[model samples]
Target: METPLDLLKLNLDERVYIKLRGARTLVGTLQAFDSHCNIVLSDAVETIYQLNNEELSESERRCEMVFIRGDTVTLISTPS
Candidate 1:
């Protein structure tokens, strides 16, 4: 049977964008993932958004390797 996670299988070892809860996002090379969507990404860029005085701003940080908890994952897609 087809499943949504199958799309992640096809995306392994590729660069993808992951949107997470709490105004966080990640872009990186997909390294590994599990059924829960708990994932590992290498050379990742993590961006966090903040709102201040009705202005939204983003900050980015780099991670050589990152382990993302499944519960935080909201969406996933190819990184253009």
Candidate 2:
């Protein structure tokens, strides 16, 4: 029988989109993950959104590797 986490298994070693708290987003190749939803990614691009004085701005940073804490994750999706 297939389970919800089965979906995540398919994304291993592939590119994925991760939505996080604080209006942050990440796109990267999946490297490793645990039951807690903590994950490691490779060649990641992190996008951060900020609001200042009613003005919204976005900034991006590139990283060769990243570790995401499970508590901050909001969603995860594999690109089609």
Candidate 3:
């Protein structure tokens, strides 16, 4: 098993999709995290439109600060 700090170390500066306890999903580039593995993110732009939608402009979104308990994170991804 990975320690929280250790897991956090693997994600620094990487973009990830974090799943919260409430079943909400957020996509962002990891900016900072604490010893407890609570994360801080930026440019956390969310995708709201359905993929089948025709409007390219519908892809627009924004960012915010969210607190997801360290244990609730289900996945993390990096940009290629």
Candidate 4:
């Protein structure tokens, strides 16, 4: 049986889609992930959406090549 962590092991340097809390979506290739899922990705982009009262604000932060804490990760799906 493939465990959750084992699944990621199959996707080294592959484009992966990560969904975090706070309406944030992350897109990048798998760099290295820690036990906390806080892994540095390669050539990544961060898409965040903020619902402030009556308006919706969106932002895109990219070019990190850095890793983020995975505590708030909602979903960690990979590409084919």
Candidate 5:
């Protein structure tokens, strides 16, 4: 069976929709993660705006990403 870290490593290049403890979802490509199980996501989506629309019109500006640390991360779902 694959460990969580192994799964993360395997799907590094793929985009993931991560669910947080507060029930918010962040969509981004898994940039990096470490032994502590913390992660850094690239081209991440924030809750304030519609990232899909922004990605369509302002792909360059939409490149801004975020780092997610610690155990607050709940789920990481990838594309099919």
Candidate 6:
């Protein structure tokens, strides 16, 4: 049976979307990852959502590369 990591391995160097804690999201090309779920990505875009005065706001930033800690990851998916 293929494990989750095996599935991830299949996605190596492919574009993926990651949902994180604190209302954050990332879209990037998968570079490398480990058993702990820690991941490295390239050409990443990070989006952050915030609530202020009962209104929601969003901000986006681009990163050439990034390392995401496993503990902060909520979900990982391929963009449709």
For lDDT, the strongest prediction is 6
TM-scores for every candidate against the unseen true structure: 0.87, 0.92, 0.53, 0.86, 0.70, 0.94
Ranking by lDDT: 6, 2, 1, 4, 5, 3
Q: How close is candidate 3 to the true structure, as a TM-score?
A: 0.53
* lDDT scores in order: 0.91, 0.92, 0.64, 0.85, 0.71, 0.94
Could you report the Cα RMSD, in angstroms, for every candidate shown? 1.5, 1.1, 5.3, 1.4, 6.6, 0.9
**In candidate 4, what are the lDDT values of residues 1-80, reduced to their tens digit?**
56788888889879999998878898998989867888878899999988768889999989858767878778888767
Candidate 2 global lDDT = 0.92
| Candidate 2 collision pairs | none
Cα TM-score of candidate 2: 0.92
Model 1: per-residue Cα lDDT over 1-80, one tens digit each: 48988877998889999999989988989999999999999999999999999999989899899999999999998955
10 residues in a row with least lDDT, candidate 5: 53-62
Candidate 5 residue-wise lDDT, 4-76, digit = tens: 6787788886888777775356788888888766888888875432356445322222446777786887777
Q: Identify the superior model by TM-score, candidate 2 or candidate 4.
A: 2
Taking the tens digit of each residue's C-alpha lDDT, what string does model 2 give over 9-32?
Answer: 889999999999979999999999
**Positional deviation of 24 in candidate 5, in angstroms?**
1.2
User: Which candidate has the highest TM-score of all?
Assistant: 6
Cα deviation in Å at residue 33, candidate 4?
1.2
